[PDB]
Amino acid sequence: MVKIRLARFGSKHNPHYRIVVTDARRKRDGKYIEKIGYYDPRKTTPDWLKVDVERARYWLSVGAQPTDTARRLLRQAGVFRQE
Amino acid sequence: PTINQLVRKGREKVRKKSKVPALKGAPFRRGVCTVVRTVTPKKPNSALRKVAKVRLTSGYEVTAYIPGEGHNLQEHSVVLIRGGRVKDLPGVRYHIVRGVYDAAGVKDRKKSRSKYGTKKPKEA
Amino acid sequence: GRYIGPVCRLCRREGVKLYLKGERCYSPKCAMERRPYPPGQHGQKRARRPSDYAVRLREKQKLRRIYGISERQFRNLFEEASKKKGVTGSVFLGLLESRLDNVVYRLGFAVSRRQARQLVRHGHITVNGRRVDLPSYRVRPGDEIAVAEKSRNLELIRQNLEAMKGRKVGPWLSLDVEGMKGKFLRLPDREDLALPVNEQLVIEFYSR
Amino acid sequence: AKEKDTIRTEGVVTEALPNATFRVKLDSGPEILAYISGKMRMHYIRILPGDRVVVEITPYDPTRGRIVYRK
Amino acid sequence: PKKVLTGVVVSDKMQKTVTVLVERQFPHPLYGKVIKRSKKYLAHDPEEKYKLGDVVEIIESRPISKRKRFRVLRLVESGRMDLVEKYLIRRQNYESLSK
Amino acid sequence: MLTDPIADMLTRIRNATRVYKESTDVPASRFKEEILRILAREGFIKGYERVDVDGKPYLRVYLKYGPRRQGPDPRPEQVIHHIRRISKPGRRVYVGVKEIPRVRRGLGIAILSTSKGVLTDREARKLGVGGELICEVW
RNA sequence: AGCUAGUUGGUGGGGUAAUGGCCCACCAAGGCGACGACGGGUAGCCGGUCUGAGAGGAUGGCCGGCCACAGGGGCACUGAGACACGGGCCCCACUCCUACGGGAGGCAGCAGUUAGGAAUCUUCCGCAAUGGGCGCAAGCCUGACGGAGCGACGCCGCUUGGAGGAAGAAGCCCUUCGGGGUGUAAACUCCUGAACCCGGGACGAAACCCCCGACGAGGGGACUGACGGUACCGGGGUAAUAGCGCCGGCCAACUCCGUGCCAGCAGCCGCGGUAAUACGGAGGGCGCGAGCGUUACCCGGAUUCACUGGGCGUAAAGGGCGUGUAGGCGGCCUGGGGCGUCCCAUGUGAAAGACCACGGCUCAACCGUGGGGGAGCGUGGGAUACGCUCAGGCUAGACG
């Protein structure tokens, strides 16, 4: 399954996540196809979420299923706003 | 030589000769000893220096120098070897470690102790 | 950690008076004035002409001593300077001065660099609102350095402030005495600093 | 520190070995590699196989010594 | 695109098959010298069409045999012993210098 | 075998410089002539022309030296201090435009064989093209 | 130094998701090779890591990719996918029970035990985050992972106080007996208040779920913390671990006593055989510092394998010469081609790292964002000065 998912990139206690296009059966850290967004849960930054929306949309169109958290993030960013 | 020549032939990569067959690149090798024999130095030097002939965990049968003004070393005493060439003594490539295993520290060695494995002066 | 211990001995060794005690290091008492010779059993013996390397090393030590710094830290700073664009010399000096403790000292929030460092450690010093407790801190242009509210009413700090009421602040710094503040205006250059040291020598020593 | 165990036993010279070294049959017991002492070297002293000489012996190797006493 | 090569027909001693010596002219990475290195390539001739001494155009292909991965696309220049002949001489020499 | 012509020419020039001679003949070539022209433009030589020693095309290289210097070793200062064939037969050196050497840090020059003709280093840079690094002159 | 007989190619077939000597029948006798095969050794490879001015060199830990193997070997089956790490069959090797016929195994998963060994961790808690799999879903499963524990194992941060304080206590150590050192160091005064106790106290966690809305978008809601009562803040609050190397030269730093070529130090030159700035100790110093040194290894320095950048009359080194094969290399002029070569454009060069900028953790390490580079390689075009290559000429080389 082609998936939009997160990947741990940071450190112990300070996590950082890459919103990403990859196959299901990789490492969560694995050689992913495309970097589309990034997430800081600790909102330490004024910009904690920014995703390239168009790319994400394209991915979705192709067949990429977002993960629960990933999906939520995308929603927050506004990739589903069909208006 | 010439460029063409070089391409034909190749540059001989200088391989470094192992100074120490303590084997494997084992920084320390433990071993059981045979004899505590004292041997004479070289040509401008004269003394009687303390050498232990060691069977090693590497399976080497090498000659190792004992540092230390007063030593305790015996036959089947279990020893550790660090290496380091002794300039006067031939056959010797090895320093026995003091203050470990069965090469106990020099008594009242109280200046450059770290080399000899002798504990801090227990001051009171 | 830090040097810790007999300070003016170092000064004596180096030959140039250094202001690590702050005061007394101003009084006829830094031992430098009536005792110029280096510490030890061989102070009043003929000092043999100093070697190329040796002089450089001395210089390095002097500079390091000035800032009360671990050698490793100094090395790191040097490396950083080297990495960065421009004259490795002046930039290095700026970086050294950019240290929080040094900044505190040169704002006359303390008499001693050591004192300043101590103050920084124990939570007496505010930088732009947030109190920082690590003397290594990088102060950069347009940054404000204040005395803590818990610390404003402290005796020592008050004394220091009084001492600095009229006492000169650097052409890169601008302190508020009565609001107990201190703005950083410019990166402290070689020209700005009367440092009794030659950084070129240090650089030479280090490039090995 | 000096280990005081530097043994001072006497001996009949037995053999001319090369390079100022001498088999010296001890009066106590065995023959040992017994090189000439530095002092002796300094003051000439040609030792001959057939002299009474005193050897400085290590207890770690009592088969190796150093002639201290000429004649 | 599928790989295009230029070489010399060196052998016709096989059925439906021809041998092609590609010569390649390239710099040494370390020494900075142009070295005429080469390789042989076993090529498919669906006709027995091409003859010894022929300069040919070689295309990368779907495999036809193990160690046979190329079809000859087209003939470029026909008949030049000189280049073949060097190779032959080399081969002969290989026989000699030995024990 | 007169194996490299450019190199030979360079050598001849060097020799001439060493002995303070006004001129050497070199065997003729278009390439050689072009190189000479470039040198002249730069300022290393008084100039050149084609002449016929034994009815064979040859090229005069008119030499250039400094003033009669004072003291021991009074001999004039050499205009060309050094010249060196770099892209030798068998040793064909080739540079990209970012890899053209600043020969003597903007004082000496290097002579380049390129698409846009036989040209100097600065000129090459200007015309943003690399090539065969024939020779260095300082 | 030659190697090859399913070996190299063919026809026809099998077998495969598919090509193919993968296999099989038959025919042909090739195929590779010194432009280094086969044979032996060594070895996972790389993105990289260190070093280095760079070119290079070594190495491939962790992290990322791929390969390859799951006691050793062989084989299939099933399935989209395996010749199948915690599936199967079979043999060997091995441990375990056996009512002797036979079965059970596989930690190169986490943890740990044992062994080897210089040397390497807790039979830790959790499904909270991320991710995985199943499932409508709840939810389960999860030694992936999150974290804590141990080890200064590395890097980074901080503390072992600061301000005063003698023309200079004591103690220790030199001394030319006057003095000098340790050293403003201490002691003592002032000030702060790591430790430490109490008070609170997380970010990380908003979704999946419910309902409005069509189960779409959108909106409101609730559950949910291993780390962890930790980070961190608020109050009080004690001056509160300094160690190691060296001290002849390199190389920073000198005196005294003991010792007497001995005991010893040493990485090299070497010091020591009675006045040792090289030994043991003591002061003094100097360098680092919660580390410091030793050893092992690698690079450097070694421009000591030299491409950048070595040489070869005598130092190592011109083969005894000749002819000659491959190979390398090549005069002048004209034209094409444009392979080299150069150039532009773009594709690619994943991320992480390494560079620059900013941002976050009290700084930094560490990490996040953004950007550039980037050797090399592909594709399209261009350029012909220079190699190459074809074609023609020339007489300065060569040959007659």
Ligand SMILES: [Mg+2]
């Ligand atoms: Mg003795």
